[PDB]
From Swiss-Prot, chain B:
Source organism (scientific name): Homo sapiens
Signals that turn on the gene: Up-regulated by IL12/interleukin-12 on activated T-cells. IL12-activated cells expressed enhanced levels of DPP4 but not mRNAs. Down-regulated by TNF. Up-regulated in migratory endothelial cells and in the invasive endothelial cells in tumors. Induced by hypoxia.
Encoding gene per record: DPP4
Disulfide bridge map: 289-300, 346-355, 405-408, 415-433, 610-723
Protein name: Dipeptidyl peptidase 4
EC number from the UniProt entry: 3.4.14.5
SUPFAM superfamilies per the UniProt record, alphabetical: alpha/beta-Hydrolases, DPP6 N-terminal domain-like
Domain text: The extracellular cysteine-rich region is necessary for association with collagen, dimer formation and optimal dipeptidyl peptidase activity.
Amino acid sequence: TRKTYTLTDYLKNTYRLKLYSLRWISDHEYLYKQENNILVFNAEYGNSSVFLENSTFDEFGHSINDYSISPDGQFILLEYNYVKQWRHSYTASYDIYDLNKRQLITEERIPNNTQWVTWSPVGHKLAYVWNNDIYVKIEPNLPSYRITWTGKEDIIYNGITDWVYEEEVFSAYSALWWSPNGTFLAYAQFNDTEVPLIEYSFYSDESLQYPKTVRVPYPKAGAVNPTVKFFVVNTDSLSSVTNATSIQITAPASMLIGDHYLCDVTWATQERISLQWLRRIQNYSVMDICDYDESSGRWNCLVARQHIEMSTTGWVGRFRPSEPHFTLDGNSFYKIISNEEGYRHICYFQIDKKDCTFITKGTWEVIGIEALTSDYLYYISNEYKGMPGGRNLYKIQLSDYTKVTCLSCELNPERCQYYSVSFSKEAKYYQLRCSGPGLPLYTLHSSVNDKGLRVLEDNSALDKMLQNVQMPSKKLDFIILNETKFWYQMILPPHFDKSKKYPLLLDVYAGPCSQKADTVFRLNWATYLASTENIIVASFDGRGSGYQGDKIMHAINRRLGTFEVEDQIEAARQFSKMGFVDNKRIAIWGWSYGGYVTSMVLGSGSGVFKCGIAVAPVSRWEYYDSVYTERYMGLPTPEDNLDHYRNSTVMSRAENFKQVEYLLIHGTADDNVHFQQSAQISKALVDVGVDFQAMWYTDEDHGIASSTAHQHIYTHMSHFIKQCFSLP
Amino acid sequence: RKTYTLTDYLKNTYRLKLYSLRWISDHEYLYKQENNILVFNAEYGNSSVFLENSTFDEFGHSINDYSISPDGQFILLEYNYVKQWRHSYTASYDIYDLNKRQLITEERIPNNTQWVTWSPVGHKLAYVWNNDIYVKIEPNLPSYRITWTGKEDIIYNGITDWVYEEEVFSAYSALWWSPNGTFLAYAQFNDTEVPLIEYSFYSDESLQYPKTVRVPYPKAGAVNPTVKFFVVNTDSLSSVTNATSIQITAPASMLIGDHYLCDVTWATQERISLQWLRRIQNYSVMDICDYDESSGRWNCLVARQHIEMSTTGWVGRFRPSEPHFTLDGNSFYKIISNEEGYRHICYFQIDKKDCTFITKGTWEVIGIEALTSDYLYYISNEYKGMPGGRNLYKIQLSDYTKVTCLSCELNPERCQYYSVSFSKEAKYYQLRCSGPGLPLYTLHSSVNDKGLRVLEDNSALDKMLQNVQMPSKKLDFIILNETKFWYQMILPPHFDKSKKYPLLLDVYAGPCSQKADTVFRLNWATYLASTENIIVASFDGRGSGYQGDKIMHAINRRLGTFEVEDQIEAARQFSKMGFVDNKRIAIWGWSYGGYVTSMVLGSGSGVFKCGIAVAPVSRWEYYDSVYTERYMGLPTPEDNLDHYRNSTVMSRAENFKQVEYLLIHGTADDNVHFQQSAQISKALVDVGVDFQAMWYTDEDHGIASSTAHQHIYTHMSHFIKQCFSLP
Ligand SMILES: *[C@@H]1O[C@H](CO)[C@@H](O[C@@H]2O[C@H](CO)[C@@H](O)[C@H](O)[C@H]2NC(C)=O)[C@H](O)[C@H]1NC(C)=O
Ligand SMILES: *[C@@H]1O[C@H](CO)[C@@H](O[C@@H]2O[C@H](CO)[C@@H](O)[C@H](O)[C@H]2NC(C)=O)[C@H](O)[C@H]1NC(C)=O
Ligand SMILES: *[C@@H]1O[C@H](CO)[C@@H](O[C@@H]2O[C@H](CO)[C@@H](O)[C@H](O)[C@H]2NC(C)=O)[C@H](O)[C@H]1NC(C)=O
Ligand SMILES: *[C@@H]1O[C@H](CO)[C@@H](O[C@@H]2O[C@H](CO)[C@@H](O)[C@H](O)[C@H]2NC(C)=O)[C@H](O)[C@H]1NC(C)=O
Ligand SMILES: *[C@@H]1O[C@H](CO)[C@@H](O[C@@H]2O[C@H](CO)[C@@H](O)[C@H](O)[C@H]2NC(C)=O)[C@H](O)[C@H]1NC(C)=O
Ligand SMILES: CS(=O)(=O)n1cc2c(n1)CN([C@H]1CO[C@H](c3cc(F)c(F)cc3F)[C@@H](N)C1)C2
Ligand SMILES: CS(=O)(=O)n1cc2c(n1)CN([C@H]1CO[C@H](c3cc(F)c(F)cc3F)[C@@H](N)C1)C2
Ligand SMILES: *[C@@H]1O[C@H](CO)[C@@H](O)[C@H](O)[C@H]1NC(C)=O
Ligand SMILES: *[C@@H]1O[C@H](CO)[C@@H](O)[C@H](O)[C@H]1NC(C)=O
Ligand SMILES: *[C@@H]1O[C@H](CO)[C@@H](O)[C@H](O)[C@H]1NC(C)=O
Ligand SMILES: *[C@@H]1O[C@H](CO)[C@@H](O)[C@H](O)[C@H]1NC(C)=O
Ligand SMILES: *[C@@H]1O[C@H](CO)[C@@H](O)[C@H](O)[C@H]1NC(C)=O
Ligand SMILES: *[C@@H]1O[C@H](CO)[C@@H](O)[C@H](O)[C@H]1NC(C)=O
Ligand SMILES: *[C@@H]1O[C@H](CO)[C@@H](O)[C@H](O)[C@H]1NC(C)=O
Ligand SMILES: *[C@@H]1O[C@H](CO)[C@@H](O)[C@H](O)[C@H]1NC(C)=O
Ligand code: NA
């Protein structure tokens, strides 16, 4: 009688989740945007004042994309003319507004096409990157000091990452790191001179007569990589008369012997910086701890303060070596590392001692360190109820490691099993964000006695809307394979009847350290397929999946396209044996790494799947970027792992596609998984005489996220699944 | 009896036999029988082995093709064949001395040679390598370099650039030997400021980074290549260190603006004719130039300059027609549009501006095939007033009233579409009948127009087809606005006019096209009619060829209008005939046909349920300058920009919500760029229209590789069958 959650509801965002995105400005206040007005809230009492009125920039003459208030609250950086580049990179125009004199600064403006801008962490200094060079402004109205002069489009990047460092190393375009009080500005320089370019057509508006060719320095597996250098500049001794001196910090000898990466930069104190370097064979990393020397004006990294992190079973870290969390004096730090059982736990290190002490342990993992005080370390883990797909906040007493308190486990155990946290400047307060299994819940807490101060947002408006919809349910459980539990989830249709046989769609990702079985609440395409179309949408975390230790995660080391593909087939075989699944109607789909796995599964000859959809799939590891691919596969050389690079392609399985219905989709402007990857799959299928369905998306990238393309792709895939399952 | 299936079509089960001969003289031809090259005596039919099947067993390479020198002393062997555009390719070549029975190992033709040609007499060679011309007087002797300006993608000497190859010459070659081989004439193209089309080429899966293919290609209204013309005396090569290439400049009427060199024809040993065309292609000038032995220059008397212009459209069918000179080179015959708009043969004196028409009537001359001192032979569609038929005629030069049809009555039931191949001095001729019955190849003597013998009658295929339920073909016309418009229908076997059949409209409809004819075909339509019981129809509406300029020039400056409307009207007319299921009318086309299909599907007519566009044009500004501007003029506000903008597929995207559409394009299409379909898909996505798509990796405009050909027709067959609810 009630309506179902339809494809139009998903595509038009009829049922919206409310958020509570705050920005901490001190240890007791935060900023929050309400009705376009920026308000300041007192954490203790919940009272607010207007920080900046929505009408302030009514005559600005530009649509403001974002804002950034200086740490001292005197200025506001206004971002406009936003032009997206890659996953994290973009260019924009900036204006600075003085909040005390209520005026826009008109002198010495930040230029247009600025690549990155950041306030110092204290006060109101600015550092920005323009034309691949770094500039520093001590005062917003004063002229800029040019820090670097070597910046060259597609070749020398100062203070910004190139394509592969942005995507695969830093998850950011910025390569600038201010010291804690803003004295020093540390930065990396990337050199892409001999990195080969990926080239692809961009069609643009119909008015463009000749297509443009986009050229991006992108190292594919085994190719020449960018090189890196690291520098530190004193921003307190800058001169208008003389050019700035940047002090270089060279990589340790164990890195300089061959290809390597800079993988982490973390300031320890006002005069101490730590850097982590990673070998191109990503199973060996080195942390250097460097001290400023006032007499020489140099940075010295003592060999007695060097820390090695290596792996004998795989690579180092989940995606990269983890960041250290230094104490106030910078003499020691806490870092998540894989223990002797292969589980990621917090280790406590002294800067000048080799052995660290694990402060946590068990067959579960620490996800992240969130805050550190002299008495407590706060962290997120999946310890609770032994559910790897759940997340809770804990605190550990630093004077007694046996004293671990869960801070979020029992707040609302039925509604909330997946949390993230935001602490105030000195951890006096924390905002907890519960993202499932129930509707998201945002709450504010004080650290002294872990008081639950108030509910910030409980999504009660959405809860009221959803009571009139026949919503699907979610089952999270496990199957046992070779004495190991592997978790899965199922999005079950409303009024689920275990005596009936439902078609099943296997939603796959299965990349290394992936997790597709979790307690998160989502309103997505699967919600529609289950609610309206009565399809079970299942996901499974097999070998190679994360947050369950290295025995599972490292099982696919040097062997992508093996165990993680076999385990999805095994999960479907097991689900197909369940009484509520129609074994004549099992489908599989995935995007990105999931598109590769879907294609490898469809080409396996298992006979389990009737049909499948691969969106922007990888097809051959030699076509993907060096940093990600080599982390798991090593090098594609006869002396390393070339035979497995050649055995793990989708193209080699083309003949096995004769038994399935396949839909292959890819954006023509995908800078990440190049269109080439799907162009080679289609050519191999054509060569063996296999019919299949295809769809290209003109000028769409890896996300196929423009409003019209997003609606079109999900509409096209819904027709395909429905046709496959004989659904009118 | 079995039907003609999709696998019969894709696997070439029912093969048409051909009879490809090569005339070597006035009475002998070469023919390949069991990989042996045989020489046949045309008069008696007796043969001998010219070159044994085993001669090149130990060559070390597969021989793609060969060419015998005109004097029969040498054979040019072509291998390492690498295809480029429609006509161009590169190859390696060896020369084999037929007398000495040995391969020439000294001063070999270089690898990556772009073009090679024997002189018309003897055994001189001219070849193009790295965009420069070279001449070898003797096959084993060093070459003489002719040009030093050749430069990849910039300067082309003796070879055409992309647009001249595709749209002007229909050939890669831009070299023309004089009749006895004394002179070598050539064109030089300069693409310096011509913009490049760029597209990815993925190659074998072993290629880690895709290649970017970059080709100088002028799109409509862009900067065009410029051209120069030269003549070199090859007999002076062994006497001078560096023989002068004498330039022949274009006339003043062409030099005032952008222009093209559109025809080169030698008249005598010392007289050459050149045709030039203005960028606005309704004005052409022919210059007739004589060698001046005293100065070593070429002079073109203004008294011998001929103007060909058009007030209703462009000049020529696709370009101005070539002249056929009398032996003394003082007069010539040329096909031109008469006062009534019908293409007929006109006879010109080289220094007189008014010509005399030698043929007339409401039909057209297709081509001049041979000219002797007493007769001119030509092909026309006069017979029975059928524009889709072709026959060979002979006209007495001393009396124009004496016109004999040589082929009309040979087998009128079986043969209504002929082409011909004459021996070197027209002593014999091979007739090639290509429909409506099975192709038939016959040999004839010109002395008495007598049939000598049947060369190939396709009796083996005839025997095979007797066991197959073959479709039939109807060729007829409908009267619209007091004008006859021809159509053809491929009808299912056992066609019953009381039954309602699904109909597929097979469209091309470009300017001067002809899709209704008498040719016998074994193709996709054969399978659709024979196995799936679908009527496959084609219609020749406004803009179609071979029926006069009133029909052909109707779409002048207005592509995407009458030729699109007339296809919609044809489907309504076929529905009126009573044997068509109006709920099951589909449309499909390739190239210009894909543009027309898309325009029809976006018209909002309601006539068509579904349609397939393969490699369509979507916007005339994306297509090349020479072809597009011939019909559309320039895309400027002063000329025809409003119509260029009004005739795109993209502007009709909203109307595609009413149909099922399949869009298909090869990614390495150098001709209709993938861009054209990339813009269609983007416009459909933008208005929220669901449709089907298929790209073909590394396939060009022909989607002709064996595997892609089989894949595309299989994919299209599934789509049409689903549209027509066929199991
Ligand atoms: C960026 O890297 C390139 C090398 O990839 C550097 O160029 C080399 O410079 C040295 C001299 O310092 C020459 O001997 C090499 O031949 C150069 N190689 C090439 C390929 O140019 C370049 O100097 C680096 N730039 C910066 C600013 O670090
Ligand atoms: C930020 O930290 C820096 C580094 O410790 C401070 O700079 C030092 O300040 C002391 C005291 O004035 C001097 O004796 C040192 O010579 C300074 N060192 C350098 C490298 O400049 C700086 O004063 C601090 N700034 C703020 C705002 O607290
Ligand atoms: C880091 O990576 C590779 C993983 O294969 C190890 O490389 C050694 O060299 C080749 C592989 O290229 C093999 O023949 C050796 O047997 C590998 N060594 C071992 C011990 O397996 C390398 O040793 C690994 N490093 C660490 C710290 O485990
Ligand atoms: C091909 O055409 C270009 C012009 O498009 C000619 O290049 C010019 O040559 C003159 C004389 O050397 C220079 O002064 C100009 O600067 C050149 N222009 C450009 C755009 O490069 C070129 O010489 C022509 N080539 C031939 C062989 O005719
Ligand atoms: C091919 O034709 C050319 C051009 O008419 C002939 O060359 C001329 O021959 C006469 C003698 O009959 C000479 O007086 C001229 O000086 C030649 N002209 C040139 C431009 O070379 C040539 O002899 C003919 N070749 C053959 C084999 O008959
Ligand atoms: C927890 S973290 O902040 O250290 N972290 C998480 C991720 C990363 N870092 C890196 N990110 C990866 C996600 O899959 C991406 C990805 C993987 C593919 F196999 C692919 F085909 C396309 C594709 F985009 C990777 N390029 C980056 C996931
Ligand atoms: C009789 S003739 O020898 O003078 N002659 C016939 C043709 C030509 N010359 C030129 N040729 C044309 C065929 O359609 C082609 C063609 C037309 C299109 F509209 C198109 F989208 C793609 C495409 F390849 C033209 N580029 C050339 C057809
Ligand atoms: C909140 O209330 C306190 C006490 O009344 C006051 O001092 C403070 O300024 C208020 N905070 C804000 C952000 O308005
Ligand atoms: C940014 O661009 C605008 C428009 O071109 C220009 O007026 C303005 O001066 C530019 N800003 C800076 C800081 O260069
Ligand atoms: C700073 O360095 C740049 C580049 O080397 C140079 O052009 C400029 O003149 C220098 N300025 C001073 C003050 O030396
Ligand atoms: C054909 O026959 C004639 C007369 O017998 C003979 O001289 C000639 O060599 C033959 N031709 C061929 C090509 O065998
Ligand atoms: C020569 O050609 C082929 C081998 O390529 C062979 O079948 C044939 O029998 C040979 N002999 C003759 C007389 O054709
Ligand atoms: C053509 O290439 C092959 C292989 O590189 C070489 O052996 C041969 O000599 C070349 N031919 C000529 C004429 O240079
Ligand atoms: C031959 O003459 C032409 C025209 O003057 C000249 O461009 C070329 O360089 C010359 N070649 C030589 C001297 O080898
Ligand atoms: C050629 O066409 C243009 C555009 O239609 C026209 O202005 C011009 O008069 C025509 N020229 C001739 C010679 O008819
Ligand atoms: Na409370």
